[PDB]
């Protein structure tokens, strides 16, 4: 839809400090103002400046261009789940492949959920990705330090939620059933999954997945979901 609590600040000066917050309300408020992305850019990407002025998290573009979860403002993105302490974000490893298809021209930061976790990819100050996104070329529009919200792309539609620990036997049975239901898949990003006595060329493959906080992911084809509210106090 639109905003959740309020709009985005003006950010008149060059770089403003980021105070620490503890309550859920102020954290949701600063997430709605696209401050978490600025904090991530100031932690590992050393990017001076803020992005998404007066745009909020509602104007964030997506690759499929038809995101039904965008109408539900209550769902939390994986970046918000990492900001809330649910999961652990992984650094940008050069050995990881990024699924092509979107045009990275004019964009400054984009995240891609990998198979063994969640990684991010951004550029430094005054630079932006090209049409292919291989390098960070110079951009005159990125010199002001304020970038609109359309320059942030989220690869794939994924939402997170609090989970419950499960024993190892159930996880092992699920992994066995998944690897038995997909005999053609052999390796996923340099991770041994099945036994094929040989590796083939990389090829895209669309399939759903879920995480239970373990090392590798678990893909599933046939699944039945159910949405329950439960009237929890955390919401």
């Amino acid at each position: 839809s639109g905003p959740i609590i309020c709009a985005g600040p003006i950010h008149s000066n060059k770089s403003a400090n980021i105070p620490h917050l503890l309550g859920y309300s102020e954290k949701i408020c600063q997430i709605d103002r696209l401050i978490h992305v600025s904090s991530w850019l100031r932690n590992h990407s050393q990017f001076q400046g803020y992005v998404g002025q007066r745009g909020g998290r509602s104007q964030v573009s997506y690759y499929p261009a038809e995101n039904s979860y965008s109408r539900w403002s209550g769902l939390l993105s994986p970046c918000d789940a990492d900001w809330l302490g649910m999961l652990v974000v992984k650094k940008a490893k050069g050995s990881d492949m990024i699924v092509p298809g979107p045009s990275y021209k004019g964009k400054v930061f984009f995240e891609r959920p990998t198979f063994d976790g969640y990684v991010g990819w951004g550029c430094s100050s005054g630079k932006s990705r090209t049409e292919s996104g291989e390098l960070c070329s110079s951009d005159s529009g990125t010199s002001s330090g304020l970038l609109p919200s359309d320059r942030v792309l989220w690869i794939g539609d994924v939402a997170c939620q609090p989970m419950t620990p499960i024993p190892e036997e159930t996880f092992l049975e699920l992994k066995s059933f998944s690897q038995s239901e997909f005999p053609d898949i052999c390796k996923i990003d340099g991770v041994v999954f099945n036994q094929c006595e040989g590796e083939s060329l990389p090829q895209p493959f669309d399939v759903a997945w879920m995480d239970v906080g373990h090392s590798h992911k678990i893909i599933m084809r046939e699944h039945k979901t159910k949405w329950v509210q439960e009237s929890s106090s955390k919401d």
Binding site: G94, M97, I98, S132, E134, L201, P202
Partner: protein, 51 residues
């Protein structure tokens, strides 16, 4: 298969030979399927686009 760099034009022989022979190139799904491709967006000043 024809290669061309965006903004510059046709590239020289070295990059196209490394794209066709080695296999660490970057192209469409057809090139990734018939010869292989590496799209890890590594550090590179330019890349000759093949299609």
């Amino acid at each position: 298969f024809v290669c061309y760099k965006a903004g510059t034009g046709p590239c020289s022989e070295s990059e196209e030979k490394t794209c066709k022979t080695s296999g660490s190139c970057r192209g469409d799904m057809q090139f990734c399927k018939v010869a292989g491709c590496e799209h890890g967006e590594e550090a590179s000043e330019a890349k000759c686009r093949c299609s």
